[PDB]
Design a protein around this ligand. Structure first.
Ligand SMILES: Nc1ccn([C@@H]2O[C@H](COP(=O)(O)OP(=O)(O)OC[C@@H](O)[C@@H](O)[C@@H](O)CO)[C@@H](O)[C@H]2O)c(=O)n1
Lengths: 560, 129
């Protein structure tokens, strides 16, 4: 039985917060209790820890903890540092004890709870401690409320430090207002000139040209989906009839070179076939002529998670009146069943969505490329010579690129490393490119675990792995072509479904075990049962064409 | 003294503070400087400092009202957490050496001298109790 440590009661002295409980199958003599954030940047030992058998009480001081200061705004876990840490899971007694002592109006408010996390949070609001200056003020509040965080599915101590807006002298305030006004005017002038040049450039042709434009705000140089379309075009002598132009930007928030700033709208107006791959906000602010075509070759493969208008009414989604994805004429998807979901996503007619196959998947059905890439990955990563290779590859837990994050602490390195040692297998990790965290690797960890977040080719590693522990990413689509099983780490399924759900129900869509906790991983891999009998139906259904000729069909459909 | 206070605070390595001294809390000291707080009251009885947070007349949790202490001296080890959290300083800073003003209560000669002096200056204390 795994050693666990629980929280039994939460006291509150004047400013001093107490946590008491017990642990099983664990000697606490050399325990080092801490308060560690989800992002793993702040650890702070409990000021006093009194230990009596398996029972314990931890004396936490919210006034002197942070190296002498107060606990800043964050969410903290109670972690028993040791050779192996332990995140203290709340006993169900605590959440039972509150549940029976609701006053009737609390019960009336209690019924409108969607999931278990809302029930948990509302029941645990009776352990809240709010510190207001003088006890009256409602504008400076230091509140600590124990709760099970939905995003990390783990007990945390949310500390919210509400502070008033502190304003500087009137000179600085006037300067800030003037700077904001100048920035707004600059943005308005840039939008005006962009619209003007684009509108003028298209208005001087009014005819069918021979120019093809590839654009992507998040792909420096030509690569990815465009590369296969471009190569298929060049193969059948389509560079001897059309002229091809490319406008690229390093990232969404980056700025553009002097030439490209005004070359992009000119080509947008002039181009008959305009290519995009992802959110390209400079295109959804203009109006196109009918003869033009805007081809949306989405990076991902299938309709797994919500995108575009399909998340309207949800946080981070566009209102139904926006033009954020509507200026398309031919959006290309990999399966027939993706037509309604993706047409809904882009807000375009369903005839604009064609099931030809995403050109990026051209290589997954190839054979010479398979041996080539296998040799390359064996030579450049000799550690993959184990009996089996496993690949962790979760998606970002944040709302978007601006809020990119991942609470890695959900993964315990040591147990997976011990499984690898027992099984002579290697597990590789590839966080999403929209991440901000950096992996940390220990002594035995380096001998099995490999941090892979730099490799340019996304599908580089999928050719070698004999498993895939991913939760929500579209990587399962590409990996599905190899007749291999995968395990799904549905760690925060309730919260994620609440924020952005899936175009299909999660429990049945996934081709593999569903898994919520780490123990479920050691159960699945230790027992070596994965339910791969359903990955072949998934590949059969969610891939319309298995010929590996997606780029050929895309170019044939677009140009003839 | 208006000119002497900031200059002396800046250049003095050891600084002794007896009670609430608001000026010393508006500046940041070097790590070499040792700011010492020797509280007038002997022991920890009535809620002082950051322990009044949430009560009327109590500082906010983020205030710097007693933080700039390097050492605080207390009567006994059972006051280390109370006074450490009252000043909002680390528990290592607070040390149980005893209050300097309690050094006067154990001297026999002064006890006898002050007994005679109080007998003289208060004739009423001639009584038994
Ligand atoms: N460890 C990893 C995991 C994934 N990848 C690549 O990243 C691309 C998208 O992955 P992900 O879906 O997670 O990103 P988004 O949320 O922005 O996709 C929004 C939505 O359109 C899409 O999911 C679709 O399935 C639903 O319509 C894919 O090409 C993956 O190969 C990677 O390089 N490394």
């Amino acid at each position: 039985v795994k050693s666990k440590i629980y929280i039994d009661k939460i006291y509150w002295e004047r400013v001093q917060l107490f946590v008491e409980g017990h642990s099983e199958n664990l000697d606490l003599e050399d325990s080092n209790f801490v308060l560690r954030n989800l992002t793993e940047t702040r650890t702070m030992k409990a000021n006093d820890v009194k230990i009596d058998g398996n029972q314990f009480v931890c004396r936490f001081n919210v006034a002197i903890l942070d190296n002498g200061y107060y606990l800043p705004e964050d969410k903290y876990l109670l972690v028993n540092e040791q050779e192996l840490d332990y995140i203290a899971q709340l006993n169900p007694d605590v959440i039972n004890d509150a549940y029976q002592n609701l006053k009737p109006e609390q019960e009336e408010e209690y019924n409108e709870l969607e999931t278990q996390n809302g029930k948990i949070n509302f029941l645990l609001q009776t352990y809240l401690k709010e510190f207001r200056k003088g006890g009256i003020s409602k504008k400076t509040v230091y509140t600590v409320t124990p709760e099970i965080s939905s995003d990390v599915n783990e007990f945390v101590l949310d500390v919210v430090v509400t502070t008033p807006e502190v304003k500087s002298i009137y000179i600085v305030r006037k300067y800030k207002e003037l700077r904001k006004y100048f920035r707004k005017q600059s943005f308005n002038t840039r939008q005006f000139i962009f619209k003007a040049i684009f509108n003028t450039t298209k208005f001087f042709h009014l005819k069918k040209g021979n120019t093809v434009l590839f654009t992507s705000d998040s792909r420096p140089t030509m690569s990815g989906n465009f590369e296969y379309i471009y190569n298929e075009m060049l193969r059948q002598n389509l560079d001897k009839k059309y002229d091809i132009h490319t406008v690229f930007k390093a990232n969404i928030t980056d700025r553009r070179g002097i030439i490209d700033k005004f070359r992009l709208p000119y080509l947008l107006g002039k181009a008959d076939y305009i290519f995009v791959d992802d959110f390209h906000p400079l295109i959804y602010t203009v109006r196109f002529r009918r003869s033009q075509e805007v081809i949306q070759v989405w990076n991902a493969v299938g309709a797994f998670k919500t995108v575009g208008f399909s998340r309207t009414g949800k946080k981070g989604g566009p209102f139904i009146d926006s033009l954020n994805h509507r200026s398309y004429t031919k959006a290309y998807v990999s399966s027939e069943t993706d037509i309604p979901f993706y047409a809904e996503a882009f807000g375009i007619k369903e005839k604009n969505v064609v099931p030809t196959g995403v050109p990026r998947t051209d290589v997954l059905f190839d054979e010479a490329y398979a041996t080539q890439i296998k040799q390359e990955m064996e030579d450049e990563l000799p550690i993959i010579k184990g009996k089996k290779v496993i690949l962790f590859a979760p998606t970002f837990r944040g709302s978007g690129h601006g809020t990119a994050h991942y609470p890695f602490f959900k993964i315990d390195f040591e147990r997976l490393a011990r499984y690898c040692e027992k099984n002579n297998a290697v597990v590789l990790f590839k966080m999403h490119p929209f991440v901000k965290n950096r992996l940390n690797i220990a002594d035995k960890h380096k001998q099995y675990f490999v941090d892979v977040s730099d490799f340019r080719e996304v599908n580089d590693i999928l050719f070698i792995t004999d498993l895939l522990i991913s939760d929500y990413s579209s990587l399962i689509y590409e990996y599905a072509v190899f007749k291999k099983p995968m395990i799904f780490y549905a760690f925060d399924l309730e919260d994620y479904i609440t924020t952005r759900d899936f175009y299909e129900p999660y429990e049945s869509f996934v081709p593999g075990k569903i898994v919520q906790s780490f123990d479920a991983l050691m159960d699945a891999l230790d027992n070596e049962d994965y339910e791969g009998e359903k990955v072949i139906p998934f590949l059969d259904k969610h891939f319309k064409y298995q010929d590996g000729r997606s780029s050929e069909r895309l170019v044939r459909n677009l140009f003839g």
